[PDB]
């Protein structure tokens, strides 16, 4: 059908979708005919290198959803194990799966089918809408096959194509209703939104780096709509009073906060783990104090006794100081060196009020340390030469950093600490009698660093 | 005839358009019309020949079936023999055969009855020059079913002969071309490659002169001629092969003229031949001015030029670079380039050794033109550095010994010494190094000669490479190393007798001139030098140690040779200059472990000797030394040296210890759970830092004893107990702890029924409790063991979760199991388990096995991998040689959600654990059973197939038994690796039969099932086991054969040959099938037969339906078990039955699952021991004396019969009959080979003669074991 040739393609394509509408039919029903059609056009969504073949699969399976719906009557739609039900069913366990081509398989599934099942109702509030949590958890499993395999770009696609339906369905149909219950969720009669919102509250901080941030965006996106229409600013304040105050501090902690073994660089994915538990501490923190979601000083101090600024100082006492995988802790470091840069940035920047929780242990030489490493030699703390993102970003994060330093007062560590390293004498000696010459690599490349981080 | 059959096609497709059915054939709803299938058929039927092919025989079987209403029987046979005329017609008037019209022709010949009788000698030569053989085959063979079946036959082994398939082509000179009683000789001869008596008797019976008993027929003297041929092609004498090849075809002077060009017979059978001596001859260096005149005057004409110049396209290019016309010579190596592509791309995929064969002369051909290319460089002549990278790539580049037939070696090696001889001539040091490469060269090809049994023509090269090699020191070592480790090899074969004689002589070229001043400057050649003298010392003195006096019985001036190197203590002379040689060697890459092996293995063969001077103390420290290289043969000796000293204790411990902690240790996970074992008994020392290093490089490996042994060994307050005790206490704490491997095994074990686990208890209370009150404590010790999962559901809670088993199973089970812990739990009595037996059966009613889904056990379906807490490794990586690398090892990531509960009594259940290999691996759990024997023997199937990759007759073949990771996480749970798309032989059998007959064999009074047990029950008095005892004597072999072939007429006898016939589409496919599945289960029957592998019913064999190679399964009898403990015994060394039979015919029996065979027990008796002291470790831990000595027996040359007697008589000693047991084991003496046969010193194929007449013997497949189903 999808084959490379105009002839041979508008030929079988017909064929294939004539063969979809009599199969789907009350007397090709409940065939294994009809099973090994819906067979085969799913080990076709979910394959390697045949990609031009998952595009058609896809429409082959929006084909499959009219179809079935078209012609099973609901006087019989209870006992098939073809319905709609069950195809969802195995699309949910097509995303669930530990294989980076079946999670893309049935984020093709549902980015063809999105646009039925919501023009669709009385049967559509239990299926997916529900099922939105079991999709996050797919953008989960996606944490570490490949960003280019394209299972987190449909991923997040597919996520985005089910939000913008939610949105406007349960914003009126929001009532105690005995909706179908996803994995996960607290067993109860009613999982209306209010639990959805509180399981997206379950885990902002979740280590895999994109599901959280659905996570947060979700938040941002649905929080005006409870019948309140309320926004987070005075939200979070009720619920962190009326809750306790432990449940927003340790819903952001992790599982997990609580050695010398890795000081010095080492894979150990456990240490990678601790490394993206506390990445995914700093941006929660960010991204909710930053905004104003909450104060700077609201959830930092230690009234509550937290636990993110010590691992933060121990980090920047210890972060710089088998062959192949000292690049990868290189990068997972570094990706963590440059999130509490942004930190440091969204909690001066946000309130001039609260630096004195900014203890002097980061205001001493740890924190300025590997700002001034970054902006020379940002090799040193691991920034692997060879990347895109990182490097052409570093010099905004920095600068970015150092103008939310500058107006507060720890700019005097700041000056008397980048004037031992960009002090004059080190420009004027690095021009040199000769720097035109063989000896390229150090002066030039010495010169190049020190002059960027002086553009800087 | 390219387009024949599309034209045919066309033309019958026509006369259907002009006919009124053009009705939409249909007419229905799901239409088109009866022509838009019919004209893009014929559209496409002209663009490929393989749809032209199948429609023209689809469609000419189609009118010939249709024609069977009308044309009357009499105009049938006229019209089917017009067919007939015209087929014979199309073959021998074909000019460029056209494989598919030759393949169409010659397949729709087969399959029709009356056209069946086609022309052998124009199918065969068809076949042979359309390179479609496989379709010749079938209708050769099928011809032969249902003089002209013996031209048959001869076309026929004409036709194997060039698709390999060599052991199916000597099945036929022996049991079809025969008769004659030297035939069988000869052939035998040259099966073991001994090429030198085989030819001898091929020239002694073609020159014979009245042998009154039958004149030899002709197609048997032309066999012979053949014979002798190809054999003195294999040792490649060509003056011999000139002689043979002008012999039969004119008189003694050489004439050699057109009279080879007449009578096409005369080409196929000498040209090759001819031409092969011939110019070989004249590459030696030699004139004779011969074949090069022949070819010059045969660059004539069409016929007498087209033959040679497209068939042959090297001997041409060889010939005319000797002639020196280097343009022609190219011509001819690129012409046949094209040639090998060409045939290459014609033989068939599914044709492997074809292409084997096809290809291995690609490098060959390769070399031709590279030398033609590399000698055309002007300067090429005055630069010598050329010439030495050349060299260098040219001693980097050889053929494999082992794996490459003696023809590709001399090709290689006589062509470049050519190649080099012409370069040396144009090059008047450089030469130095010319004669270095030569020698070395024809050293290297002596070498591989030798280790792949071909004796002789290792003898004829160093005897022509000995006029040269004197003019160093080096060479003179070197030929005589060569010669005398020549002789050690090929003294192996031979009688003790024998051996001794030609071992003794390799002794006086052994002290002359090459010991003297030469054992001071090269100390590694002066050890080889050591070892080739301590070996021949070796050999003599283990000849001799057979008998005390018949040895030193038949002997001559020699034995002043005996007496100076009474006559019991030459043995301890010879032994000990053989020891002094030996260890001089020792105190001197493998050659310090070839050293470490010889000395090893001579102290501890004469250790077994004495069993009946610390070598106990000797070998470990050579053992240890090798295994801390690499070694399979050194891998093993920590038990019997760790015996010997639990005899001994004061002596080499320390040393042992020693040598064993300087090492990579990664050699031990092969042999780790024999060494944990030792840690629960005394000097468990033996093995702690190995296993401490191990667990923190490749950690998982004590769970699996130390659950088990360490409650099943009591740790008293001995000093060293209690040290070793809290040394795998602290190992298990630091190998235990992630608690996630426990985790695994605990999901695994609530994936068990609770009924069987239940079933267990119950067996274990009744057989422990229940034979005297007096062993107290147990129960009390093992009853929380139970309860943590059975009883009350919380208990698998707090340990895994909550399980669905026993939410409807403790629930269900409360009132009872609130019996059990009030009273069973101090009762101590088992005097009445009618309760347990309620239970149980409540338990089989209510507690249903299909538990449906994986869901049962939530960790193994949620598993769900989120976070590093030692993360599972999914058992069974980690083989041994090779440095484990558990990152490349694939790691569990899910679970697939179904579970099948495969139906068996126990019934373990086979379930799809995911992996991040992005593929996926299923396997089988058994819970409650041990699975140490599966494990065991698959290791002992890895090292027998590691044998046979090294045997060069079994490697050729490719000879490997297909295993299976199996992999015991502890007794009671197991897991194993369950192969893919394959299925069990029962499936085949009862699939292809059709639905009568399956309905006859299952339910029908006549079936051989209720025919067996009513033949039982009516001439033996009762229904149950014990009738055979009762019955054997009065059921004489005559009345027992023919009630066998009574009840096995019934079952069908073509029904697994149309199972390959009916999945195959090509006759190819059916070769290909048919010859997987002969060898495989060939060599499955005779390795289960050196290892009694009872129970062999038709359900413990899987095939590939992918394949048809065979795999064996479910090895719950390791040795000799259902002949010796089993109340019904198994007198039978394996499974050749009846269908197994005839698969192959009208090829017999002893073709091709004999020569397999052969080669195998051939390659198992060639040992080091491996097989004979795994097999020590195999059993002796906790009569196996006598299994081993069994083992030990029927290894080293035995007669399977009184194998199978002693078997017997260890395990029925008194027993009803036993007399007719021995009578039925031993055989007949007039009808059964291995009666007649002697004791032992049977050799391969007289041991394996006697085990398949013992196998297919009808004395014991008359009587055995009903659900053994002797009749399929
Ligand atoms: C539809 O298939 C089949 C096949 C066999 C049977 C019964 O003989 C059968 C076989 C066992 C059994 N035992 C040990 N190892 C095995 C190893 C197996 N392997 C490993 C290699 O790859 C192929 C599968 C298979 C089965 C094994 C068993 F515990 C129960 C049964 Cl009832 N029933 N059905």
Same mark, same amino acid.
């Given at each position: ?92 366990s097509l995303?669930l799966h530990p294989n980076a081509?079946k999670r ?37 499993l ?315 | ?455 002789? *023509? #290792? ?5 022509? !490479?000995? %006029? =040269? ?6 060479? &003179? +070592? ?120 010889? *000395? #090893? ?5 004469? !250790?077994? %000797? =004495? ?6 103390? &000797? +070998? ?80 998982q490996?004590?769970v ?34 992630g608690?996630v491997i426990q985790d695994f095994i605990n999901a695994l074990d609530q994936l068990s ?47 895994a979760f ?49 538990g449906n889904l994986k869901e049962c056990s939530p960790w193994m379906s949620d598993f769900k991998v989120e976070?590093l807490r030692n993360e599972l490794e999914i058992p069974g990586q980690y ?7 558990p990152?490349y090892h694939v790691r569990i990531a899910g679970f697939d959600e179904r579970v099948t509960v495969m ?5 373990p259940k086979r379930i799809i654990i995911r992996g991040h290999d992005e593929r996926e691996h299923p396997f089988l759990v058994k819970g409650?059973?041990?699975l140490?024997?599966?494990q ?28 299976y990771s199996v992999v015991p996480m502890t007794?009671?749970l197991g897991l194993i690796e369950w192969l893919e798309n394959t ?290």
């Amino acid at each position: 059908a999808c084959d490379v040739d105009q002839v041979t393609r508008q030929l079988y394509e017909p064929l294939v979708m004539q063969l979809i509408h009599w199969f789907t039919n009350n007397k090709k029903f409940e065939s294994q005919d009809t099973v090994a059609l819906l067979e085969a056009i799913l080990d076709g969504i979910v394959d390697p290198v045949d990609s031009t073949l998952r595009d058609f699969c896809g429409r082959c399976i929006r084909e499959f959803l009219k179809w079935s719906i078209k012609q099973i009557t609901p006087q019989q739609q209870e006992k098939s194990p073809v319905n709609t039900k069950s195809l969802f069913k195995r699309l949910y366990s097509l995303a669930l799966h530990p294989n980076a081509f079946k999670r893309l398989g049935a984020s093709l599934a549902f980015n063809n089918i999105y646009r039925e099942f919501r023009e669709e109702e009385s049967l559509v509030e239990q299926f997916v809408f529900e099922a939105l949590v079991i999709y996050m958890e797919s953008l989960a499993l996606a944490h570490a096959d490949e960003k280019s395999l394209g299972t987190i770009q449909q991923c997040c696609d597919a996520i985005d194509h089910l939000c913008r339906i939610i949105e406007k369905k349960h914003v009126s149909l929001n009532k105690a209703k005995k909706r179908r219950l996803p994995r996960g969720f607290p067993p109860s009669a009613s999982l209306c939104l209010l639990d959805l919102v509180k399981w997206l509250l379950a885990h902002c901080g979740r280590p895999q780096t994109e599901c959280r941030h659905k996570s947060i965006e979700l938040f941002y996106k649905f929080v005006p709509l409870l019948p309140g229409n309320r926004s987070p600013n005075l939200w979070l304040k009720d619920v962190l009073k009326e809750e306790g105050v432990s449940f927003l501090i340790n819903t952001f902690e992790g599982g997990g906060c609580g050695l010398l073994y890795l000081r010095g660089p080492f894979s150990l994915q456990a240490t990678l783990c601790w490394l993206d538990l506390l990445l995914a501490a700093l941006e929660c923190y960010n991204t909710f104090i930053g905004e104003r979601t909450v104060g700077a000083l609201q959830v930092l101090g230690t009234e509550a006794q937290s636990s993110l600024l010590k691992a933060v100082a121990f980090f920047l006492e210890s972060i710089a100081m088998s062959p192949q995988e000292g690049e990868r802790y290189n990068y997972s470091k570094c990706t963590v060196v440059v999130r509490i840069m942004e930190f440091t940035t969204t909690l001066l920047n946000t309130s001039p009020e609260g630096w004195k929780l900014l203890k002097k242990d980061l205001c001493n030489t740890h924190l300025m340390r590997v700002l001034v490493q970054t902006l020379c030699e940002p090799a040193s703390i691991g920034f692997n030469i060879g990347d895109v993102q990182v490097m052409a970003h570093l010099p905004d994060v920095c600068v970015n950093l150092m103008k939310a330093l500058k107006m507060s007062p720890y700019k005097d560590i700041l000056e008397t600490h980048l004037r031992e390293k960009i002090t004059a004498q080190s420009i004027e000696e690095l021009c040199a009698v000769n720097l035109y010459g063989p000896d390229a690599q150090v002066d030039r490349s010495r010169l190049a660093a020190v002059v960027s981080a002086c553009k800087q | 005839e390219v387009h024949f059959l599309s034209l045919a096609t066309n033309f019958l497709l026509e006369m259907t358009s002009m006919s009124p059915d053009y009705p939409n054939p249909m007419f229905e709803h799901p239409q088109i019309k009866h022509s838009s299938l019919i004209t893009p058929l014929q559209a496409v039927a002209q663009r490929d020949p393989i749809i032209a092919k199948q429609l023209f025989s689809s469609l000419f079987s189609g009118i010939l079936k249709e024609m069977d209403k009308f044309k009357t029987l009499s105009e049938k046979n006229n019209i089917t023999q017009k067919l007939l005329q015209d087929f014979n017609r199309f073959l021998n008037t074909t000019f460029s055969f056209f494989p598919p019209f030759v393949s169409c022709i010659q397949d729709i010949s087969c399959q029709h009855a009356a056209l069946l009788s086609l022309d052998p000698a124009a199918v065969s030569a068809g076949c042979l020059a359309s390179l479609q053989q496989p379709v010749g085959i079938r209708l050769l063979e099928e011809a032969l079913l249902r003089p002209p079946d013996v031209l048959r036959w001869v076309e026929l082994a004409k036709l194997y002969r060039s698709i390999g398939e060599y052991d199916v082509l000597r099945g036929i000179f022996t049991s079809e071309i025969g008769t004659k009683q030297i035939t069988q000789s000869a052939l035998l001869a040259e099966a073991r490659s001994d090429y030198s008596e085989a030819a001898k008797q091929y020239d002694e019976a073609l020159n014979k002169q009245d042998w009154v008993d039958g004149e030899p027929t002709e197609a048997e003297k032309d066999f012979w001629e053949l014979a002798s041929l190809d054999c003195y092609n294999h040792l490649a004498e060509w003056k011999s092969l000139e002689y043979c090849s002008t012999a039969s075809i004119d008189s003694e002077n050489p004439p050699d003229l057109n009279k080879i060009w007449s009578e096409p017979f005369y080409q196929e059978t000498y040209l090759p031949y001819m031409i092969r001596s011939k110019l070989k001859l004249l590459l030696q260096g030699e004139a004779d001015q011969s074949l090069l005149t022949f070819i010059d005057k045969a660059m004539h004409g069409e016929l007498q030029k087209a033959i040679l110049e497209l068939h042959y396209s090297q001997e041409l290019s060889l010939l005319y670079l000797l002639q020196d016309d280097v343009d022609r010579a190219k011509y001819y190596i690129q012409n046949g380039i094209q040639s090998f592509m060409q045939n290459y791309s014609s033989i068939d995929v599914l044709l492997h050794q074809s292409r084997l064969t096809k290809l291995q002369s690609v490098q060959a051909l390769t070399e031709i033109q590279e030398f033609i290319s590399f000698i055309s460089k002007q300067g090429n002549l005055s630069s010598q550095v050329p010439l030495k990278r050349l060299l260098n790539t040219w001693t980097n580049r050889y053929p494999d010994a082992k794996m490459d037939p003696m023809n590709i070696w001399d090709d290689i090696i006589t062509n470049r010494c050519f190649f080099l001889s012409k370069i040396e001539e144009k090059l008047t040091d450089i030469s130095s190094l010319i004669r270095s490469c030569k020698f070395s060269m024809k050293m290297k090809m002596i070498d591989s000669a030798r280790k792949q049994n071909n004796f002789s *023509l #290792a003898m004829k090269l160093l005897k022509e !490479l000995h %006029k =040269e090699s004197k003019t160093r020191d080096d060479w &003179l +070592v070197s030929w005589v190393q060569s010669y005398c480790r020549l002789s050690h090899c090929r003294s192996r074969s031979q009688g003790c007798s024998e051996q001794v004689l030609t071992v003794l002589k390799t002794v006086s070229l052994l002290d002359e001139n090459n010991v003297s001043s030469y054992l001071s400057k090269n100390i590694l050649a002066f050890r080889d030098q050591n070892i080739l003298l301590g070996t021949t010392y070796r050999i003599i003195a283990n000849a001799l140690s057979s008998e005390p006096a018949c040895l030193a019985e038949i002997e001559e001036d020699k034995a002043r040779r005996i007496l100076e190197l009474d006559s019991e203590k030459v043995i301890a002379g010879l032994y000990q200059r053989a020891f002094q040689h030996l260890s001089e060697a020792v105190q001197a890459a493998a050659g310090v472990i070839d050293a470490y092996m010889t *000395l #090893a293995d001579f102290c501890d063969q004469q !250790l077994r %000797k =004495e069993e009946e001077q610390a070598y106990p103390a &000797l +070998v470990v420290e050579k053992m240890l030394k090798a295994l801390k290289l690499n070694s399979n043969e050194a891998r093993l000796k920590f038990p019997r040296l760790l015996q010997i000293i639990e005899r001994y204790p004061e002596e080499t411990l320390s040393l042992m210890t020693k040598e064993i902690s300087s090492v990579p240790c990664w050699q031990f996970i092969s042999w780790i759970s024999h060494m944990v074992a030792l840690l629960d008994k005394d000097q468990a020392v033996a093995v702690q830092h190995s296993v401490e290093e191990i667990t923190d490089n490749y950690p998982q490996a004590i769970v699996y004893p130390f659950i088990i042994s360490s409650e099943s060994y009591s740790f008293k307050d001995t000093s060293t107990g209690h040290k070793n005790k809290e040394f795998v206490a602290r190992i298990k704490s630091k190998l235990d702890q992630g608690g996630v491997i426990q985790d695994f095994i605990n999901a695994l074990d609530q994936l068990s029924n609770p009924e069987l686990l239940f079933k267990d208890w119950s067996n274990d209370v009744r057989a422990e409790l229940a034979k005297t009150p007096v062993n107290k404590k147990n129960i009390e010790k093992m009853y929380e063991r139970m309860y943590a999962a059975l009883g009350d559901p919380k208990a698998p809670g707090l340990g895994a979760f909550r399980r669905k088993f026993i939410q409807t199973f403790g629930k269900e089970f409360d009132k009872h199991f609130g019996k059990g812990g009030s009273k069973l739990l101090r009762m101590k009595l088992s005097d009445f388990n009618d309760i347990t037996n309620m239970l149980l059966l409540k338990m089989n009613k209510d507690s249903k096995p299909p538990g449906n889904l994986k869901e049962c056990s939530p960790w193994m379906s949620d598993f769900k991998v989120e976070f590093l807490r030692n993360e599972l490794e999914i058992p069974g990586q980690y083989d041994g040689r090779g440095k484990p690398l558990p990152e490349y090892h694939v790691r569990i990531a899910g679970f697939d959600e179904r579970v099948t509960v495969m139906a068996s009594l126990r019934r373990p259940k086979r379930i799809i654990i995911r992996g991040h290999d992005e593929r996926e691996h299923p396997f089988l759990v058994k819970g409650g059973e041990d699975l140490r024997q599966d494990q065991r023997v698959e290791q002992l199937f890895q090292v027998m197939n590691g044998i046979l990759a090294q045997d060069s007759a079994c490697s050729q073949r490719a000879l490997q038994l297909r295993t299976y990771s199996v992999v015991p996480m502890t007794s009671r749970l197991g897991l194993i690796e369950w192969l893919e798309n394959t299925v069990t032989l029962k499936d085949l059998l009862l699939n292809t039969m059709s639905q009568e007959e399956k309905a006859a064999y299952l339910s029908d009074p006549r079936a051989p099932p209720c025919e067996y047990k009513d033949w039982l029950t009516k001439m033996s008095g009762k229904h149950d086991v014990g009738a055979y005892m009762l019955m054997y004597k009065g059921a004489n072999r005559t009345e027992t054969v023919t009630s066998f072939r009574k009840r096995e007429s019934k079952v069908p006898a073509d029904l697994l040959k149309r199972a390959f016939v009916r999945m195959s589409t090509s006759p190819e496919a059916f070769l290909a099938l048919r010859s997987h599945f002969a060898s495989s289960h060939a060599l499955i029957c005779i390795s289960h037969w050196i290892l009694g592998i009872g129970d062999r019913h038709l359900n413990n064999f899987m095939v590939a339906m992918e394949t048809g190679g065979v795999i064996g399964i479910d090895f719950g009898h390791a040795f000799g078990s259902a002949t010796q403990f089993l109340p019904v015994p198994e007198l039978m060394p394996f499974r050749l039955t009846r269908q197994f039979i005839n698969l192959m015919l009208p090829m017999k029996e002893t073709g091709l699952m004999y020569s397999i065979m052969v080669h195998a027990l051939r390659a198992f008796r060639s040992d080091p021991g491996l097989l004979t002291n795994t097999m020590d470790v195999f059993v002796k831990e906790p009569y196996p004396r006598q299994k081993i000595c069994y083992a030990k027996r029927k290894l080293a040359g035995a007669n399977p019969a009184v194998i199978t007697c002693d078997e017997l008589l260890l395990g029925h000693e008194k027993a009803p009959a036993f007399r007719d047991y021995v009578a039925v084991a031993r055989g007949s003496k007039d009808h059964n080979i291995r009666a007649q046969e002697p004791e032992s010193g049977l050799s391969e194929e007289t041991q394996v003669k006697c085990l398949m007449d013992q196998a297919t013997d009808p004395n014991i497949l008359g009587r055995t074991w009903e659900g053994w189903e002797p009749w399929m």
